[PDB]
Amino acid sequence: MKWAVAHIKSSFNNTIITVTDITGAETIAKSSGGMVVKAARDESSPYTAMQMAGQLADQLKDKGINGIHIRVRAPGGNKQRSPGPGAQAAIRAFARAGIRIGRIEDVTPVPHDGTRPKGGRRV
RNA sequence: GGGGGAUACUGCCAGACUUGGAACCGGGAGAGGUAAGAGGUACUACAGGGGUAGGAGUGAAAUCUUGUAAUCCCUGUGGGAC
Ligand SMILES: [Mg+2]
Numbered sequence: 001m002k003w004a005v006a007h008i009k010s011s012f013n014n015t016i017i018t019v020t021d022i023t024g025a026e027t028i029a030k031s032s033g034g035m036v037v038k039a040a041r042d043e044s045s046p047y048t049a050m051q052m053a054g055q056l057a058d059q060l061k062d063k064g065i066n067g068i069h070i071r072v073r074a075p076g077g078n079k080q081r082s083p084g085p086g087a088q089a090a091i092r093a094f095a096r097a098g099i100r101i102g103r104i105e106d107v108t109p110v111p112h113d114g115t116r117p118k119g120g121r122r123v
Numbered sequence: 124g125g126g127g128g129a130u131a132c133u134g135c136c137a138g139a140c141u142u143g144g145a146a147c148c149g150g151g152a153g154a155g156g157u158a159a160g161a162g163g164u165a166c167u168a169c170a171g172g173g174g175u176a177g178g179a180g181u182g183a184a185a186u187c188u189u190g191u192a193a194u195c196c197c198u199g200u201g202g203g204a205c
Pocket residue numbers: 120123
C-alpha cells in the first residue's frame with residue numbers, strides 16, 4: 001500500500017502534471033502537455049489530460065504505487081484563478097487507469113489582495 | 124424744503140417668548156480623521172532537496188525563457204506593494 005500525490009497545474013494553455021510522495025520533496029513521475037503531445041494548441045485538451053494520466057499510471061505501477069491524492073491548482077493569484085479543464089479529465093483518466101483516487105483538493109493559491117493584477121479590462 | 128394726523132407695516136429703542144439655530148448629558152451606530160503597531164494571503168529574491176525536455180504566450184505564431192537543469196514539487200531565509 002503505497003500512497004502518492006499528483007500535482008496538476010492546469011491552465012488555459014497547459015496542464016503540467018507531476019507526481020510526488022507524501023513529503024513532496026521527491027518526485028516520481030512527471031509529464032506536461034508538450035512532453036508527450038507536439039501541438040501547443042492541444043496541450044490543454046481533456047484528451048491530452050487523459051493521455052498524460054495514462055502515461056503516468058504505468059510509471060506509477062512500475063514504481064509500486066496504486067493510489068494518489070490530487071492537489072489540483074490553477075496558476076492563481078494575479079493570473080487565471082479557477083482550475084482548468086484538465087483537472088477532472090486527469091483524475092478520471094487516473095481512475096480509469098486502475099490507480100485509485102482518494103481525496104482531491106483544489107489548492108490553487110488564492111490571494112486576498114496580492115500584487116497588481118495584470119490585465120487590459122476589455123482586451 | 125418744511126409743518127400737522129395715523130402707528131398697520133417695515134428700520135430705530137428696551138426687554139421677553141420657544142419652536143429656528145447654539146450648548147450639555149444618556150445608552151447605541153459608522154470602511155469619519157490623524158498616529159502607532161501587529162497581521163492575512165499571494166507574489167517575488169536567493170539558496171537548498173527532487174526531477175529531466177520544455178515552460179510562457181497566441182486566433183494562430185514568434186520574440187522571451189530553459190540542458191549554466193527552467194517548468195512543477197519540497198524546505199528556509201529576506202523583500203515591497205497590496
Ligand atoms: Mg488596451
